[PDB]
């Protein structure tokens, strides 16, 4: 009695919200929340897709997705640590030395 | 050539030097203490730690240091002690121990009270010492007068000094165990302190500040039956001490919190004036009760 | 069935009465008892004397690596959560695969312990000497 | 509203409300019992003057806490400051909301169970974190950081300590767990899991010796020092229902829950829960507090590999007898 | 259950929108926890009980360490808030807003063209996920453990103080 | 279907690489020894490369719902293992330039190699996803290996954010595709449709999002802007690995996904891939015109060559010749990038400080280091598709495949891009010989590797029949 289309629309809405929060924010941290939002929206879409067909494959893909989310969050947090230690500021528009 | 010549007993907003002979001693001579808003603000700003005056280098190029005032009124601060401690995260960078929040001017009182009336003031110098605080003052006064005390006076003063030493060491052990984290043995330790207090109440007539030693002797004689209470305490103590050892002082958590923490060698204990337990723990066997025996300590 | 609906209603009422009791308790705490008018009321407690700066300074921490390793090991933990509820039906092949999994976990933890990670203690004491 | 289904739903709702009222009242009564039991452990009596045996001391404390000035600091974030006692009071209550106290007496017979307990612990950490950050105090900041480190230490292995019981029962349901122990209680096959869950569950409520955030001696009561009024009482009651929840959870996953030879099942559940509550008061009184760096080292290097080895051995034993 | 799914979707949408347009990092993290709890409610509505369980178990651990880094780095009183306020300008966010809107419109139009029969809401236990995870999907688990090992090694190497 | 010891034999390089990854991790934990760890990495990769013989003697098998092993997977496994071995060989002296710890580099190198094996044997959407991230994450590690450097940290941050966003896009597209289809295997992505109803907006949009993610992974326009910044920022062995092994592995899994799925018959996907290939060739060849830096020039070169590869991949459905053309050009591309980036690695080794400049100054290289200059100039001769080199054989195969299926716009784009590539490649080659104003056996080993690559390029350009024969021997399931 839940259409699959509404769940896919919800996942797409959170996906574009995370993309917007990534693009409009120059803070590296808020980019990391943005990335977590897109990853969790894709995982949510996999969960609805698996629930429609009655298969555990969507939940397995969710597990792989959150494993990737945790690993990428740890690596981005380490890079944010290094950037804040070696530049004393967390603006991503200052990371522009390589160009042309 | 002194690095930081600043006041350590009196606040920085203090005029005059207290131990000079022309400075009046009593608070009734001066104006009474009126605490107004302006004086409260000025004295609260004077007590504020200013890190540039000690060269603290507040912050770093990457991350800032954070300053913490532990005392006064901290459960781990055993008294009026304030330490101002600089932290990077958890680690301590440097410490500025600020004292003077417990100044009573007892030397100026020694220039204010007579020879006999100064004994309660000597007794309150260390409030866990009592007769142990009394002993050097009355011995120095007897040196001044030319009085040689008899044997019974020496035995009585040695007994009271050892009783108050047991009381002080019991309190010290209980506070160390509580500061490690075990809150149980302090109650039993204070029960043994109550036994010692019963004995000291029997002899001197007071619990913790006896004010009992005199010039050339003691105040009263020993009452009829002090040996019974001493026998009761000497039976009560060693089993309780073994219980405290087996409950907390052989605990591996207390050992982990205690062993290797703030360790220093003999050179640090000598150049910094450390005496008592630390100096003997560094291997320097300099005890006054053996090297320069006072009050007939050669007979024990 | 009937029992599932009954348990769902019981859980919903449990949550509703829990939040209601907590909010009523907060309201009764806030509305009963007089207030205060003092000069040094709105000062953070730093043991009787004023602060040097504020409480919102950039505090360092040595727990960063352990935090990331905690997240990674909790993901390995969720994998073992998924494994543990179906051990009997997985058979011995699943046991061998989970043994390889836990062996990789143990090798990673030994790698963390030996290289100096999970060791952020200050070099002064370190429970030494 | 005259139907057997509707009266059954109403009876289940009444049972859930009765369970909630009893566990909250038992948490407050066991705050009073902690005072009395610390008196007993430390060779005294504690409060035995307000009524018979001090039984009205709790009412006097409740009256004072309600009529104490509930204070919100100006330098604090008000919403977070008010929100943290709500989480502290409610998260462990919802964790208790899955514990089966008697056959036919359970709020929610979830298919997740101990997963829901892990969820509620992970939500309960935010109460302490938000109380530390929101109050705008340096001691509270240090207490919040210490609480975060301790949470790292225990939550790295809490679920893995429970996975031995989960694997032995073969399911995540609570009633299946308490029915799998109909022959032998789970403390004997899962003993290393038992001690690791004991360590992690004392670290859940931040009770002694794991009172790193609210350390009385070290940080002068820690994170809730700006907290006053009935919010501090909410912190107390929340930690006490946390203790009740962890005790009842050990009863269900290691001692058969309600299962007993002679007494009625709720009586056995009550005796085992009260014994573990007594063990909580004893574990507060008995051994001292370690340094939180050594606490995290012990929780990482010792407890986590022990839980992994115990899970492997339990899986091998289960598949051996199949 | 249908109402639960719809209200959790609405709460997740509103909380995510408040996350991406907030200047307080701790408040943004709080709204993020609210959004992830709403996502968990969506998961629990659809019969994926294990997905919601792991959404509350390990993501609350993930947002925990995000909070530790936020208190370790960003909080300086209002100085972070004004600095974030001067960064966000109207043209700055209306730039990619129309791009996200047209992307959402295209994705929604592609979604609406698929055949549907409605999700029956049949629950999926963790036992079936354990069967499939350690059955047909074994090397997914093993090489995902290797992936987590790689992420751990990289986090160690880059995150070091010195 | 379950796992058999025969399936264990067919999985030999993956098992060997994982086991030796555990081995080098335990050796790092035992003692921080650089020589022993790098050596154990070398025998681990070589053991996988020689277990390829036992995999070939085993045969083609559908080992998992996930994995399928055949000549396609074996060939791409061999290519990524050769790239990993070369990356270790060139990374060794640069790491003796490194002041900090030097042991995690090889550990990440073989973890990325394991991801390459997983992508090579990938016949599932889950395995494709896991291979992409198992390749990406060690590259996040290796690009920011020298975090004290400005450019390495900047490129690490850029690659991490962009690849996490691309992984999010690819995951969402995979979720939409699974929502339409209901099965995650490659062969079942569009099986329920029939009678010309292969086009459906949800499946098409899902495959478009995976196209976005994969085209990020192959630097396809307009997901190409990271390539010069990451290539310049990353260390030279990291640039070697990212140019060779990553590109071969994701392009092999893209070829697999577009061959075994029935969605390859759809004309709209073919049209948008033709547009992407045209834009990639023209943009990558045009942006390397006025480049004064060798690394950004090679990044745009990677963009253009992946455009040529996509041009070859477009004509897969009609002609039966596109797969061996893709394999031949991928082998030539691997050897060309290995030689060129190996010369960059040897002239960048040792690591002479992070604060000191890492500028190349290729001008006048022949007058002091003549052998490396000879390898570099024959490498630029190979990259331009000039005869007596393998790059011409790859370009000839691509052109013949495009002519076979009548894709004339791609042919014209290939010619124009080859002319611009001729210009800048031969400008670099001549600047190697103008008038500009070590002492260890591992640097000699790197010199041997670049000399072997140059000789292989010359021999297989003069005589390309053995490469064609061993590529056609890698005959997968039609
Ligand atoms: C406001 C909330 C009001 C109550 C909402 C409904 C509660 C009941 C519920 O969600 O039940 C669904 C599920 C249990 O379903 P179950 O019985 O396992 O399935 C049928 C058995 N074949 O149980 C669940 O999904 C419960 C798991 C999620 C619970 C979240 C509780 C709040 C967490 C955040 C607090 C802040
Ligand atoms: C309902 C739930 C609750 C039920 C109630 C009953 C169970 C209560 C369980 C309480 C658990 C308390 C755990 C306390 C752990 C403390 C660990 C710690 O911090 O140890 C560190 C300490 C020193 O470490 P060290 O190596 O010296 O320092 C390194 C510095 N270079 O290391 C040492 O001193 C070494 C010894 C460490 C001992 C660790 C704890 C052992 C197990 C817990 C204690 C026993 C509990 C009862 C068990 C059953 C008794 C019948
Ligand atoms: C505003 C207040 C919070 C609003 C959101 C949470 C409550 C939503 C209303 C739920 C009311 C109960 C309900 O509808 O339950 C139905 C269903 C029961 O579970 P199931 O077994 O799937 O259903 C078949 C029954 N035989 O329930 C389900 O399937 C799932 C029920 C909701 C998910 C669990 C609770 C999530 C709470 C999230 C809180 C987020 C922060 C606020
Ligand atoms: C826990 C209830 C009291 C137990 C019995 C006393 C415990 C030891 C108190 C030690 C102490 C002393 C003597 C003390 O003088 C002092 O400074 C004012 C402290 O800080 C508050 C102390 O902690
Ligand atoms: C000290 C005991 C703490 C128990 C906490 C949980 C109690 C919840 C309320 C239970 C009420 C019902 C008890 C069982 C009733 C049915 C059996 C009656 C005969 C024993
Ligand atoms: C200082 C550097 C700042 C960089 C900010 C970049 C912002 C990019 C915003 C792009 C908005 C595009 C909106 C749609 C345009 C029309 C559709 C695409 C082109 C056909
Ligand atoms: C003005 C003098 C120029 C002398 C140029 C000498 C070039 C020698 C080249 C030797 C072979 C290198 C590899 C070619 C392929
Ligand atoms: C700059 C690139 C120019 C490429 C020109 C390609 C011309 C292709 C003509 C195809 C004609 C097809 C007719 C049917």
Residue C50, domain extent: 2-115
Q: Do E121 and A2 touch (CB under 8 A)?
A: yes
Query: In a 10 Å sphere around its CB, with 0-12 CB exposed, 13-18 middle and 19+ buried, how is residue F437 labelled?
Result: exposed
Indicate if the alpha-carbon torsion angle F419, F420, F422, F423 is positive or negative: positive
Mutation to probe ligand 7, out of F343, F367, F369, F374 (largest number of atoms < 8 A from CB): F374
Q: Do F66 and E140 touch (CB under 8 A)?
A: yes
Number of domains forming the structure of chain C: 1
3-state secondary structure of D257: coil
Q: What is the DSSP letter of D290?
A: P
Q: How far is Cα of residue A14 from the mean position of the Cα atoms in its chain?
A: 10
**CA D126/CA F407 separation, integer angstroms:** 60
Residues 6+ apart with CB under 8 A from D73: C42, C44, D81, D135, D136, D226
Phi/psi for B225 (5° steps) reads 125, 10
**CA D320/CA E2 separation, integer angstroms:** 45
State the alpha helices, DSSP H only, in chain D: 4-41, 57-67, 78-96, 114-134, 138-155, 158-169, 174-180, 192-204, 230-254, 265-286, 292-297, 304-320
Q: Tell me the domain boundaries of chain F.
A: 1-478
Residues 6+ apart with CB under 8 A from F152: F143, F144, F145, F146, F233, F234, F235, F354
Q: Tell me the pairing of strands B213-214 and B91-98.
A: unpaired
3-state helix/strand/coil string of A75-90: HHHHHHHHHHHHHCCC
F403: left (phi over 0), alpha (psi -120 to 50) or beta: alpha
Q: Closest Cα to residue F48, out of F106, F117, F107?
A: F117
**CA D122/CA E67 separation, integer angstroms:** 13
First to last CA, chain E: 53
**CA B268/CA B249 separation, integer angstroms:** 26
Query: In a 10 Å sphere around its CB, with 0-12 CB exposed, 13-18 middle and 19+ buried, how is residue D219 labelled?
Result: buried
Measured between CA atoms, the residue of chain B closest to residue C60 is B89
Q: Which residue owns the Cα nearest ligand 1 atom 22? A: E123
Query: CATH code at C86?
Result: 1.20.58.1610
Phi/psi for B257 (5° steps) reads -75, -15
Is the peptide bond between F350 and the residue preceding it cis, with omega within 30 degrees of 0? yes
3-state secondary structure of E121: coil
**CA E137/CA F124 separation, integer angstroms:** 10
E143 touches chain A (CB under 8 A): no
**CA D186/CA E79 separation, integer angstroms:** 55
Helix (H) or strand (E) holding B91: strand B91-98
Residue pair C90/E130 in contact (Cβ under 8 Å)? The answer is yes
Helix (H) or strand (E) holding E57: helix E49-73
Q: Closest Cα to residue E76, out of C75, F315, B59?
A: B59
Q: Which residue owns the Cα nearest ligand 2 atom 1? A: D247
Q: Is residue C12 part of a domain?
A: yes
Which residues, in sequence order, are bridge partners of residue B95? Answer: B85
The helix-helix angle for F71-96 and F322-348 (nearest 10°) equals 10
Phi/psi for C113 (5° steps) reads -70, -45
CATH tag for A4-87 (out of 3.40.50.620, 2.30.40.10, 1.10.287.3510, 1.10.1040.10): 1.10.287.3510
**CA D200/CA D150 separation, integer angstroms:** 10
10 Å Cβ neighbour count for B6? 9
**CATH match of E1-159 with 1.20.120.1200:** yes
**CA F174/CA F151 separation, integer angstroms:** 33
B256 touches chain D (CB under 8 A): yes
B276: left (phi over 0), alpha (psi -120 to 50) or beta: left
Q: Is residue C126 part of a domain?
A: no
Mutation to probe ligand 3, out of E8, E11, E16, E56 (largest number of atoms < 8 A from CB): E8
3-state secondary structure of D101: coil
**CA D201/CA F476 separation, integer angstroms:** 56
Q: Is residue C123 part of a domain?
A: no
3-state secondary structure of C62: coil
The helix-helix angle for E49-73 and D138-155 (nearest 10°) equals 140
Distance from CA of F311 to the nearest CA of A (A): 27
Is the peptide bond between B252 and the residue preceding it cis, with omega within 30 degrees of 0? no
CA dihedral B84, B89, B90, B91 (to 10 degrees): -70
**CA F321/CA F400 separation, integer angstroms:** 9
Residue pair A30/A57 in contact (Cβ under 8 Å)? The answer is no
Residue count of chain B? 300
Residues 6+ apart with CB under 8 A from D16: C10, C11, C13, C14, D107
Q: Closest Cα to residue F321, out of F186, F457, F471?
A: F471
C-alpha distance from residue B104 to each of B7, B125, B208 (Å): 15, 9, 19
What approach was used to elucidate this structure? cryo-EM
Residue pair F48/F16 in contact (Cβ under 8 Å)? The answer is yes
Both tokens assigned to F226: 């990271």
3-state secondary structure of B148: coil
Distance from CA of D81 to the nearest CA of E (A): 12
First to last CA, chain C: 68
Chain breaks in chain C (C to N over 2.5 A) after: none
First to last CA, chain B: 48
Ligand 4 atom with minimal separation from the B81 CA = 17
Both tokens assigned to F91: 């990374």
3-state secondary structure of B296: coil
Between the CA of A51 and the centroid of ligand 7 the distance, in Å, is 67
Residue pair D132/D213 in contact (Cβ under 8 Å)? The answer is yes
Q: What are the b/e assignments for B160-185, b being 16+ CB within 10 Å?
A: bbebbebbbebbebbebbbbbbbbbb
Residues 6+ apart with CB under 8 A from F124: F64, F65, F66, F67, F184, F185, F186
Q: What are the b/e assignments for B265-283, b being 16+ CB within 10 Å?
A: eeeebeeeebeeeebeebe
Distance from CA of F184 to the nearest CA of C (A): 21
The set of chains that have 3 or more CB pairs under 8 A with A is B, C, E, F
Is the peptide bond between B72 and the residue preceding it cis, with omega within 30 degrees of 0? yes
Tokens 């165990």, residue? B177
Both tokens assigned to F34: 């650089």
Residue pair F208/F58 in contact (Cβ under 8 Å)? The answer is no
Q: Do C85 and D172 touch (CB under 8 A)?
A: yes
Measured between CA atoms, the residue of chain A closest to residue E93 is A24
**Touch between chain A and chain D: 3 or more Cβ pairs under 8 Å:** no
Residue pair A35/F161 in contact (Cβ under 8 Å)? The answer is yes
Tokens 């709500």, residue? D86
What Rg value do the Cα atoms of chain A yield, rounded?
Answer: 17
Residue pair D304/D156 in contact (Cβ under 8 Å)? The answer is yes
Q: Closest Cα to residue C72, out of B152, B187, B92, A71?
A: A71
Residue pair D129/D144 in contact (Cβ under 8 Å)? The answer is yes
Q: Closest Cα to residue F73, out of F217, F204, F200, F255?
A: F255
Query: In a 10 Å sphere around its CB, with 0-12 CB exposed, 13-18 middle and 19+ buried, how is residue F307 labelled?
Result: buried
- D105 C-beta closer than 6 A to ligand 5: yes
Strand order in the sheet with B66-69: B66-69, B82-88, B91-98
Residue pair C45/D225 in contact (Cβ under 8 Å)? The answer is yes
Q: Closest Cα to residue F239, out of F197, F313, F293, F317?
A: F293
Q: Which residue owns the Cα nearest ligand 5 atom 9? A: D19
Phi/psi for F357 (5° steps) reads -70, 140
Q: Tell me the domain boundaries of chain A.
A: 4-87
Could you tell me how many helices (H) and strands (E) chain E has, helices first? 7, 0
Residue pair F276/F147 in contact (Cβ under 8 Å)? The answer is no
3-state helix/strand/coil string of chain F: CCCCHHHHHHCHHHHHHHHHHHHHHHHHHHCCCHHHHHHHHHHHHHHHHHHHHHHHHHCCECCCCCECECHHHHHHHHHHHHHHHHHHHHHHHHHHCCCCCCCHHHHHHHHHHHHHHHHHCECEHHHHHHHHHHHHHHHHHHHCCCCCCHHHHHHHHHHHHHHHHHHHHHHHHHHHHHHHHCCCEHHHCCCCCCCCCCCCHHHHHHHHHHHHHHHHHCCCCCCCCHHHHHHHHCCHHHHHHHHHHHHHHHHHHHHHHHHHCHHHHCHHHHHHHHHHHHHHHHHHHHHCCCCCCHHHHHHHHHHHHHHHHHHHHHCCCCCCCHHHHHHHHHHHHHHHHHHHHHHHHHHHCCCCCCCCCCCCCCCCCCCCCHHHHHHHHHHHHHHCCCCCCHHHHHHHHHHHHHHHCCCHHHHHHHHHHHHHHHHHHHHHHHHCCCCCCCCCHHHHHHHHHHHHHHHHHHHHHHCCHHHHHHHHHCCCCC
Which of E73, E108, E154 lies closest to A75 in CB terms?
A: E154
**CA D1/CA D7 separation, integer angstroms:** 8
Q: What is the DSSP letter of D109?
A: -
Between the CA of B212 and the centroid of ligand 1 the distance, in Å, is 74
């Amino acid at each position: 009695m839940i259409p699959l289309q509404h769940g896919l629309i919800l996942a797409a809405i959170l996906f574009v919200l995370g993309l917007t929060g990534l693009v409009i924010r120059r803070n590296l941290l808020f980019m990391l929340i943005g990335l977590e939002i897109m990853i969790n929206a894709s995982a949510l879409a996999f969960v609805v897709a698996g629930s429609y067909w009655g298969q555990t494959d969507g939940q397995v893909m969710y597990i792989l997705a959150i494993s990737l989310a945790a690993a990428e969050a740890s690596i981005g947090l380490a890079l944010l640590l290094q950037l804040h230690r070696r530049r004393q500021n967390l603006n991503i528009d200052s990371v522009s030395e390589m160009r042309g | 050539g002194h690095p930081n010549l600043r006041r350590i007993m009196m606040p920085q907003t203090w005029k005059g030097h207290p131990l000079r002979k022309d400075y009046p001693a009593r608070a009734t001579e001066f104006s009474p203490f009126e605490l107004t808003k302006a004086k409260q603000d000025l004295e609260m700003e004077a007590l504020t730690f200013k890190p540039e005056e000690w060269g603290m280098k507040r912050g770093t190029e990457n991350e800032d240091f954070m300053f913490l005032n532990l005392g006064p009124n901290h459960p781990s601060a055993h008294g009026a002690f304030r330490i101002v401690l600089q932290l990077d995260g958890e680690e301590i960078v440097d410490c500025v121990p600020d004292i003077g929040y417990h100044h009573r001017g007892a030397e100026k009182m020694g220039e204010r009270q007579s020879w006999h009336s100064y004994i309660p003031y000597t007794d309150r110098i260390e409030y866990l010492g009592g007769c142990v605080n009394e002993m050097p003052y009355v011995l120095a006064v007897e040196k001044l007068a030319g009085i040689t005390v008899p044997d019974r006076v020496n035995v009585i003063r040695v007994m009271l000094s050892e009783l108050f030493r047991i009381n002080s060491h019991l309190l010290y052990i209980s506070t160390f165990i509580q500061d490690v984290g075990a809150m149980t043995p302090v109650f039993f330790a204070f029960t043994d302190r109550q036994k010692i207090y019963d004995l000291v109440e029997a002899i001197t007539g007071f619990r913790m500040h006896p004010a009992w030693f005199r010039i050339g002797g003691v105040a009263h004689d020993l009452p009829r039956g002090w040996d019974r209470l001493l026998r009761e305490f000497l039976d009560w103590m060693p089993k309780r001490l073994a219980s405290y050892e087996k409950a907390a002082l052989q605990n591996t958590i207390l050992k982990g919190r205690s062993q290797g923490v703030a360790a220093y060698g003999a050179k640090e204990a000598l150049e910094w004036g450390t005496t008592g337990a630390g100096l003997r723990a560094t291997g320097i066997d300099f005890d006054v009760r053996k090297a320069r025996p006072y009050s007939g300590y050669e007979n024990f | 069935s009937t029992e599932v609906i009954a348990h769902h209603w019981a859980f919903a009422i449990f949550l509703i009465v829990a939040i209601g009791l907590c909010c009523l308790m907060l309201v009764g705490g806030w509305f009963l008892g007089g207030r205060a008018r003092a000069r040094s009321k709105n000062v953070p407690f730093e043991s009787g004397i004023d602060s040097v700066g504020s409480a919102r300074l950039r505090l360092s921490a040595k727990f960063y690596l352990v935090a990331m390793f905690f997240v990674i090991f909790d993901v390995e933990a969720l994998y073992l959560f998924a494994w543990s509820t179906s051990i009997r039906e997985s058979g011995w092949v699943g046991f061998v695969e989970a043994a390889i999994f836990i062996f990789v976990l143990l090798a990673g933890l030994v790698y963390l312990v030996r290289i100096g990670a999970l060791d952020w203690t200050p070099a002064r004491s370190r429970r030494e000497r | 509203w005259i139907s057997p289904e509707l009266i059954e739903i109403l009876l289940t709702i009444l049972k859930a409300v009765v369970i909630l009222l009893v566990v909250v009242t038992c948490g407050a009564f066991m705050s009073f019992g902690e005072r009395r039991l610390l008196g007993l452990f430390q060779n005294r009596y504690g409060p035995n003057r307000v009524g018979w045996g001090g039984s009205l001391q709790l009412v006097a404390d409740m009256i004072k806490m309600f009529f104490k000035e509930d204070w919100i600091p100006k330098f604090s974030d008000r919403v977070i400051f008010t929100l943290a006692p709500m989480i502290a009071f409610t998260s462990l209550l919802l964790a208790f909301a899955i514990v089966p106290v008697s056959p036919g007496w359970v709020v929610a017979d979830l298919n997740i169970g101990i997963l829901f307990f892990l969820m509620m612990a992970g939500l309960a950490v935010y109460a302490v974190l938000f109380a530390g950050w929101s109050s705008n105090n340096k001691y509270s900041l240090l207490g919040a950081m210490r609480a975060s480190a301790q949470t790292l230490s225990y939550e790295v292995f809490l679920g893995l300590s429970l996975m031995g019981v989960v694997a032995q029962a073969g399911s995540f349901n609570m009633t299946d767990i308490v029915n799998s122990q109909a022959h032998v209680w789970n403390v004997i096959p899962q003993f290393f899991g038992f001690i690791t869950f004991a360590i992690a569950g004392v670290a859940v409520c931040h009770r002694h010796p794991f009172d790193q955030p609210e350390a009385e001696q070290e940080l002068a009561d820690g994170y809730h020092i700006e907290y006053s009024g009935m919010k501090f009482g909410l912190f107390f009651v929340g930690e006490y229902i946390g203790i009740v929840t962890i005790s009842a959870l050990m009863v269900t996953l290691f001692f058969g829950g309600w299962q007993g030879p002679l007494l009625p099942p709720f009586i056995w559940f009550a005796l085992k829960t009260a014994f573990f509550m007594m063990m909580f008061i004893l574990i507060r009184a008995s051994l001292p507090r370690p340094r939180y760096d050594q606490v995290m080292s012990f929780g990482w290097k010792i407890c986590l590999p022990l839980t992994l080895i115990n899970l492997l051995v339990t899986a091998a034993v289960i598949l051996w007898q199949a | 259950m249908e109402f639960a799914f719809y209200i959790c979707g609405l709460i997740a949408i509103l909380a995510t929108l408040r996350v991406i347009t907030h200047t307080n990092p701790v408040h943004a993290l709080l709204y993020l926890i609210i959004s992830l709890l709403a996502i968990s409610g969506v998961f629990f509505s659809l019969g994926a009980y294990f997905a919601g369980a792991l959404e509350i178990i390990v993501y609350a651990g993930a947002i925990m360490v995000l909070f530790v880094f936020v208190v370790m780095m960003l909080n300086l009183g209002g100085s972070e808030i004004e600095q974030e306020r001067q960064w966000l300008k109207p043209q700055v966010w209306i730039g990619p807003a129309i791009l996200s809107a047209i992307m959402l419109v295209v994705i929604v139009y592609a979604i609406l063209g698929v055949n549907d029969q409605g999700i029956d809401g049949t629950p999926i236990s963790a036992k079936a996920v354990g069967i499939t995870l350690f059955g047909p999907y074994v090397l997914a688990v093993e090489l995902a453990s290797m992936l987590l090992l790689a992420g751990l090694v990289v986090a160690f190497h880059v995150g070091r103080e010195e | 279907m379950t796992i058999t010891p025969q399936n264990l034999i067919a999985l030999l390089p993956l098992l060997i690489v994982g086991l030796t990854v555990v081995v080098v991790m335990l050796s790092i934990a035992w003692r921080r020894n650089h020589f022993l760890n790098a050596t154990l990495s070398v025998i681990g990769l070589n053991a996988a490369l020689v277990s390829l013989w036992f995999v070939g003697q085993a045969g083609a098998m559908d080992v998992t719902p996930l994995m399928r092993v055949d000549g396609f997977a074996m060939l791409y496994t061999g290519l990524v293992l050769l790239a990993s071995l070369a990356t270790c060989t060139f990374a060794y002296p640069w790491l003796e330039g490194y002041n900090d710890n030097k042991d995690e580099f090889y550990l990440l190198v073989l973890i990325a190699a394991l991801g390459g094996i997983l992508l090579a044997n990938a016949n599932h959407l889950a395995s494709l996803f896991l291979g992409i991230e198992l390749i990406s994450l060690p590259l996040f590690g290796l690009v920011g290996y020298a975090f004290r450097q400005k450019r390495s940290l900047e490129a690490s941050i850029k690659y991490t954010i962009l690849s996490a966003a691309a992984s999010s896009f690819l995951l969402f597209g995979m979720a939409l595709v699974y929502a339409q289809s209901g099965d995650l295997s490659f062969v079942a992505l569009g099986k329920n449709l029939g009678d010309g109803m292969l086009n459906e907006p949800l499946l098409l949009a899902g495959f478009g999002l995976m196209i976005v993610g994969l085209g990020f992974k192959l630097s396809l326009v307009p997901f190409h802007l990271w390539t010069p910044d990451v290539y310049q920022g990353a260390p030279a062995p990291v640039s070697t690995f990212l140019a060779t092994a990553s590109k071969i592995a994701i392009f092999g899994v893209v070829m697999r996904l577009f061959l075994y799925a029935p969605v390859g018959d759809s004309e709209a996907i073919r049209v948008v891939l033709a547009i992407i290939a045209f834009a990639s060739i023209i943009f990558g060849n045009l942006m390397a015109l006025s480049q004064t830096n060798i690394k950004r020039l090679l990044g745009y070169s990677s963009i253009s060559h992946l455009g040529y590869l996509l041009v070859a991949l477009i004509a897969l459905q009609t002609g039966e010749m596109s797969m061996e053309a893709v394999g031949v050009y991928l082998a030539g591309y691997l050897f060309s990038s290995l030689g060129a980036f190996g010369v960059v690695s040897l002239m960048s080794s040792p690591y002479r400080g992070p604060d000191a400049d890492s500028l190349f100054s290729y001008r006048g290289l022949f007058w002091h280091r003549p052998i490396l200059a000879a390898v570099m100039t024959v490498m630029m001769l190979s990259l331009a598709g000039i005869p007596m080199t393998l790059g011409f054989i790859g370009k000839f195969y691509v052109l013949a495949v495009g002519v076979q299926a009548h894709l004339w716009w791609l042919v014209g784009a290939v010619v124009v891009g080859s002319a611009i590539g001729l210009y800048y490649y031969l400008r670099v080659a001549v600047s190697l010989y103008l008038h500009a104003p070590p002492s260890n056996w591992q640097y000699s080993a790197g010199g041997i590797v670049v000399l072997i690559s140059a000789l292989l390029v010359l021999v297989l350009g003069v005589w390309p029949q053995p490469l064609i024969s061993i590529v056609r021997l890698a005959m997968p399931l039609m």
